[PDB]
Amino acid sequence: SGFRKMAFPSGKVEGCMVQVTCGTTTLNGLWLDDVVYCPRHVICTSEDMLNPNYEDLLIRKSNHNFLVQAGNVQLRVIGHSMQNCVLKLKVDTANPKTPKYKFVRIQPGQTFSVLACYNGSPSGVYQCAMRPNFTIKGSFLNGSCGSVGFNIDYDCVSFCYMHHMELPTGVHAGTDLEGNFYGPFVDRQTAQAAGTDTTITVNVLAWLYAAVINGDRWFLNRFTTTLNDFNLVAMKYNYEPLTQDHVDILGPLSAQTGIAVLDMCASLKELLQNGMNGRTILGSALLEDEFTPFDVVRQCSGVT
Amino acid sequence: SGFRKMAFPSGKVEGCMVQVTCGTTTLNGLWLDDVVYCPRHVICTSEDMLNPNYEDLLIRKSNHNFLVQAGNVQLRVIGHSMQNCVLKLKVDTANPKTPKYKFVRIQPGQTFSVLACYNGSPSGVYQCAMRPNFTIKGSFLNGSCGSVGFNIDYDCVSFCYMHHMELPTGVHAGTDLEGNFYGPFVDRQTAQAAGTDTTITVNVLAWLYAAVINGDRWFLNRFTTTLNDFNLVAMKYNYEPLTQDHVDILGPLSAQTGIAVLDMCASLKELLQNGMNGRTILGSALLEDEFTPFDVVRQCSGVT
Numbered sequence: 011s012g013f014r015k016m017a018f019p020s021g022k023v024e025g026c027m028v029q030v031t032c033g034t035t036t037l038n039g040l041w042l043d044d045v046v047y048c049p050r051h052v053i054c055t056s057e058d059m060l061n062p063n064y065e066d067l068l069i070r071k072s073n074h075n076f077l078v079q080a081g082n083v084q085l086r087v088i089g090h091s092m093q094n095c096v097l098k099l100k101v102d103t104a105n106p107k108t109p110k111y112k113f114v115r116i117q118p119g120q121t122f123s124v125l126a127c128y129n130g131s132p133s134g135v136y137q138c139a140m141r142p143n144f145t146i147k148g149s150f151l152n153g154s155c156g157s158v159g160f161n162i163d164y165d166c167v168s169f170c171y172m173h174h175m176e177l178p179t180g181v182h183a184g185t186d187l188e189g190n191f192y193g194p195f196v197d198r199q200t201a202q203a204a205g206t207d208t209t210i211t212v213n214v215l216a217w218l219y220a221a222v223i224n225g226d227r228w229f230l231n232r233f234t235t236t237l238n239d240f241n242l243v244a245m246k247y248n249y250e251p252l253t254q255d256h257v258d259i260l261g262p263l264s265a266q267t268g269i270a271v272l273d274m275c276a277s278l279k280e281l282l283q284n285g286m287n288g289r290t291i292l293g294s295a296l297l298e299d300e301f302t303p304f305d306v307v308r309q310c311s312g313v314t
Numbered sequence: 315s316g317f318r319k320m321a322f323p324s325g326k327v328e329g330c331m332v333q334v335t336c337g338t339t340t341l342n343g344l345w346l347d348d349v350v351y352c353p354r355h356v357i358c359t360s361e362d363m364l365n366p367n368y369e370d371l372l373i374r375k376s377n378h379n380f381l382v383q384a385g386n387v388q389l390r391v392i393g394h395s396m397q398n399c400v401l402k403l404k405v406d407t408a409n410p411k412t413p414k415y416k417f418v419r420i421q422p423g424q425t426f427s428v429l430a431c432y433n434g435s436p437s438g439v440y441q442c443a444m445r446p447n448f449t450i451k452g453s454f455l456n457g458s459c460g461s462v463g464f465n466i467d468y469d470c471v472s473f474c475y476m477h478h479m480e481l482p483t484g485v486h487a488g489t490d491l492e493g494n495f496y497g498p499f500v501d502r503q504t505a506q507a508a509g510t511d512t513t514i515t516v517n518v519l520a521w522l523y524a525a526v527i528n529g530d531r532w533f534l535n536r537f538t539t540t541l542n543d544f545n546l547v548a549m550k551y552n553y554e555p556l557t558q559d560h561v562d563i564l565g566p567l568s569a570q571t572g573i574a575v576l577d578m579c580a581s582l583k584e585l586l587q588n589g590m591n592g593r594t595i596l597g598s599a600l601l602e603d604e605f606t607p608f609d610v611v612r613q614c615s616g617v618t
């Protein structure tokens with residue numbers, strides 16, 4: 011028992027981190043097979059970032075201008091190309107530490123682990139959710155660009171995020187591994203609106219099931235509700251509307267605990283309307299939305 | 315910017331995990347050089363755990379009774395010995411993946427990363443603090459015994475914890491790597507009292523400094539206090555008494571922010587006396603005590 015915001019073991023991803031330098035800019039790259047992926051803004055100077063013309067900036071660069079170092083060893087760059095907001099540097103050596111991997115574009119509300127890196131060196135790992143507004147609330151300083159987000163299924167790493175930018179509001183934006191931004195963001199030093207964010211309702215419900223499994227039960231009540239009634243409350247409190255697809259994914263947790271999904275919705279409704287009255291749930295004094303139903307099942311069953 | 319409960323990259327520790335089986339019991343072991351360390355209760359059956367005589371139980375075991383498997387490969391056991399509550403199995407092969415390492419006994423209030431494992435396989439990593447009462451609030455299921463806690467200083471892994479037991483209250487207890495329990499716990503299936511726990515005051519203050527650095531400033535006030543006045547409040551709220559040693563370790567954060575330590579104490583005093591009034595600090599609705607002053611500096615500066 012016990013319930014923690016657990017990240018995936020980062021070993022498989024640590025073996026892929028490299029440092030990429032172009033001119034005076036250094037950031038992180040991801041070396042998989044004979045390709046190194048990194049944010050295309052590695053080719054910009056500080057003055058270029060105000061309004062960069064990436065195609066023109068890349069044209070002044072040759073393979074030898076991209077310095078890629080894997081710890082201590084230097085990689086020989088034999089090709090370069092831009093795909094959306096990422097650069098792909100073809101190298102002459104396949105990474106011997108390349109795990110089995112996939113590139114996946116995750117949905118908002120899904121979770122993943124981030125391996126924060128500086129100068130190609132891993133510094134820490136944490137679990138987070140892609141917000142409904144396609145930002146992430148990470149921990150990133152200058153030099154962290156190119157750090158990646160991922161999930162692990164047994165021996166396969168599904169890379170879903172590459173860090174690119176910190177918005178003026180302190181939240182983070184980045185791309186999938188084909189260089190497509192999540193959300194409306196562009197890789198330019200301009201003020202950019204992240205949408206209104208909402209709380210990931212299905213994740214809060216999953217976490218309430220994790221609380222019951224672990225013995226935190228005070229919030230359970232004698233009430234039930236309907237999806238329509240619940241969604242009026244979700245609306246008022248800026249929670250995502252719950253759908254039957256969300257109820258279906260909560261099925262295993264409902265089965266394990268014997269608490270019907272709409273009954274857990276009535277508990278959530280009362281917590282939204284009354285607050286926690288100074289109590290905690292799984293050591294939190296707010297409703298947690300960074301665990302998906304799959305995360306709860308994995309953690310509560312013991313998946314490696 | 316952004317502030318997260320970050321764990322160390324677990325790669326160096328993943329390479330040391332093995333599965334250890336003795337009879338019908340399987341748990342995790344730590345393979346460093348030519349020695350595998352694991353909880354001595356691997357030699358117990360369920361009926362033995364009520365009141366085990368470990369010396370007598372170990373005497374019925376030979377080297378060939380300990381099955382150690384590193385992923386797919388089998389290790390040959392050429393020696394076994396008990397040191398306090400850990401078993402040390404000498405193997406004929408040095409782990410090729412042994413990182414630079416130290417065994418350290420941490421102080422209560424210090425933090426570390428745990429790599430939760432099942433059957434020798436890493437499942438997840440999370441950061442936690444050793445409570446003032448020498449328990450940890452982890453996430454551990456049956457089969458997680460032998461999972462370790464550690465810190466990383468550049469290339470050196472300081473192992474500080476090995477998981478042994480879940481108390482009837484759902485909190486966790488374990489040993490240093492010489493097999494000495496942290497706290498009064500014994501490796502026996504008996505109800506055991508964990509002391510009264512307290513909040514790690516110096517860590518909450520460190521986290522309030524991390525909040526100011528990251529822009530969460532609402533809790534700053536026009537007041538100051540003294541160590542004596544503050545400790546009367548710390549007493550009332552079951553916080554650890556603050557000492558000049560704690561003030562000294564907060565010095566770098568006080569210097570970086572320009573907020574004198576006793577002024578931050580007055581902010582903490584008001585938060586203890588008034589609560590958060592429904593506001594949050596770094597996304598938390600309670601006072602967080604799982605970041606040491608060193609953790610805050612490392613995270614806020616970018617240490618790899």
Ligand SMILES: CC[C@H](C(=O)Nc1cnncc1C)c1cccc(Cl)c1
Pocket residue numbers: 051059150151152153154155174175176177196197198199200315
């Ligand atoms: C030059 C990096 C900079 C940025 O926001 N990166 C950082 C990443 N994470 N935490 C802090 C910083 C400073 C940037 C400016 C404008 C657009 C883009 Cl794509 C990137």
Ligand SMILES: CC[C@H](C(=O)Nc1cnncc1C)c1cccc(Cl)c1
Pocket residue numbers: 011355363454455456457458459478479480481500501502503504
């Ligand atoms: C046989 C393991 C058991 C235990 O508490 N382990 C577990 C560890 N973590 N989460 C759950 C469990 C079940 C145990 C009983 C009594 C003493 C000792 Cl040293 C260990």
